[PDB]
Amino acid sequence: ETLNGGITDMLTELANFEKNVSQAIHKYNAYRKAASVIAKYPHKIKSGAEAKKLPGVGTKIAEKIDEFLATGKLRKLEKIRQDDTSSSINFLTRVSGIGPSAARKFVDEGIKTLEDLRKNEDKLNHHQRIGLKYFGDFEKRIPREEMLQMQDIVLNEVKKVDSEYIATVCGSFRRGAESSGDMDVLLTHPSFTSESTKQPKLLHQVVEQLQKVHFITDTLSKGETKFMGVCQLPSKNDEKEYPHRRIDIRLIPKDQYYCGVLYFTGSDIFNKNMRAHALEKGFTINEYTIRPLGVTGVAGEPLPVDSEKDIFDYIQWKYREPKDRSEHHHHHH
DNA sequence: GTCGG
DNA sequence: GCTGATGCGCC
DNA sequence: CCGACGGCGCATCAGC
Ligand SMILES: [Mn+2]
Ligand SMILES: [Mn+2]
Ligand SMILES: [Mn+2]
Ligand SMILES: [Mn+2]
Ligand SMILES: [Mn+2]
Ligand SMILES: [Mn+2]
Ligand code: NA
Ligand code: NA
Ligand code: NA
Ligand code: NA
Ligand code: NA
Ligand code: NA
Ligand code: NA
Numbered sequence: 133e134t135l136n137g138g139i140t141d142m143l144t145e146l147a148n149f150e151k152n153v154s155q156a157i158h159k160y161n162a163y164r165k166a167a168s169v170i171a172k173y174p175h176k177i178k179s180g181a182e183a184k185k186l187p188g189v190g191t192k193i194a195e196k197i198d199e200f201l202a203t204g205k206l207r208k209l210e211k212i213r214q215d216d217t218s219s220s221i222n223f224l225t226r227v228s229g230i231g232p233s234a235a236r237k238f239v240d241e242g243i244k245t246l247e248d249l250r251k252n253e254d255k256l257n258h259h260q261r262i263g264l265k266y267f268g269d270f271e272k273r274i275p276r277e278e279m280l281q282m283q284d285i286v287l288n289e290v291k292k293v294d295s296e297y298i299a300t301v302c303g304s305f306r307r308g309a310e311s312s313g314d315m316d317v318l319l320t321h322p323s324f325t326s327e328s329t330k331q332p333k334l335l336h337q338v339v340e341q342l343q344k345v346h347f348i349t350d351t352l353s354k355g356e357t358k359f360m361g362v363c364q365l366p367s368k369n370d371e372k373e374y375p376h377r378r379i380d381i382r383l384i385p386k387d388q389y390y391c392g393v394l395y396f397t398g399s400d401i402f403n404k405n406m407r408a409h410a411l412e413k414g415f416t417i418n419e420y421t422i423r424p425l426g427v428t429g430v431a432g433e434p435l436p437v438d439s440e441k442d443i444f445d446y447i448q449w450k451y452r453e454p455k456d457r458s459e460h461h462h463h464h465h
Numbered sequence: 466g467t468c469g470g
Numbered sequence: 471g472c473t474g475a476t477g478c479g480c481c
Numbered sequence: 482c483c484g485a486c487g488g489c490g491c492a493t494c495a496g497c
Contacts, residue, residue, distance in 0.1 A: 162466040190467045231478045358490050398481040407487040418488050
């Protein structure tokens with residue numbers, strides 16, 4: 133059903149090879165960009181020349197597209213698929229906590245399959261152990277209806293610790309997706325701003341309560357402002373158990389909420405595009421601030437921002453609503 | 466790998 | 471302890 | 482070996 137679906141799958145697959153196997157993070161991003169603009173292109177691509185007009189598609193991808201349009205495949209990708217070392221490395225990176233470095237190391241030590249991973253628990257750190265343990269569950273997408281139940285648990289229990297926390301479920305959920313990979317919760321509290329931490333355990337207290345009602349079930353990593361863990365909906369009595377889910381919680385300075393929500397709403401590729409455009413307009417954006425770059429490449433004072441749209445306005449973009457910050461594709465008949 | 470120099 | 475590099479993660 | 486490319490939190494290491 134997807135317009136230019138073959139091409140866009142081909143680019144995503146090369147991208148992943150580059151990140152996981154080549155550890156070539158810049159080529160990964162070039163292939164992701166190429167895939168993103170091709171998938172948002174509303175016409176069927178017929179040659180490499182055409183694709184080459186799109187920003188981020190250059191001679192080599194045009195050559196591949198030309199090849200893919202002739203044969204319906206890419207010999208470069210056939211070779212990679214036959215390579216059992218690449219394949220196992222690629223696979224191992226899908227476990228949370230195993231990245232391209234650990235995957236390569238595991239694979240040359242004879243750990244090539246899940247079965248092999250579950251045999252060598254003792255080599256895994258705590259993150260990796262938890263990612264192994266929930267590997268199948270984490271592959272499942274969360275239906276928006278379960279996101280609503282998880283939301284109702286998180287808001288209720290946040291309120292119970294302190295009425296002046298505000299929690300906002302961002303990510304794909306806030307962009308309106310019908311399913312989400314995980315749940316990302318943006319949290320503020322007026323004791324925490326860019327200038328002061330008036331209370332010390334602001335994030336912890338929330339996490340503690342979420343463990344106490346048995347909603348958060350495991351921890352991957354945790355600091356003063358970002359928690360990363362596992363969570364799970366409580367089931368109907370006797371009914372089947374719900375799969376475990378990833379949950380991310382980020383506490384942001386109350387007075388930098390808009391930059392924070394912009395960041396945490398994504399998509400990841402919108403953020404990258406938006407922040408790249410800001411750079412070429414002479415601004416630098418992160419989850420806290422938008423700052424102008426000095427003539428010498430150095431960021432100055434933060435600019436005032438009273439809404440998400442103020443940030444767009446600064447870099448001369450039409451405000452795009454959350455739903456329009458997702459990636460999209462087109463269809464053929 | 467692509468683009469701005 | 472601090473700073474800076476590497477690895478892995480978030481959007 | 483042209484160099485930038487989005488920006489940063491948490492975990493852990495190295496060197497001081
Ligand atoms: Mn579709
Ligand atoms: Mn489009
Ligand atoms: Mn998410
Ligand atoms: Mn997440
Ligand atoms: Mn028809
Ligand atoms: Mn994501
Ligand atoms: Na097609
Ligand atoms: Na181009
Ligand atoms: Na991974
Ligand atoms: Na920890
Ligand atoms: Na489970
Ligand atoms: Na631009
Ligand atoms: Na205002």
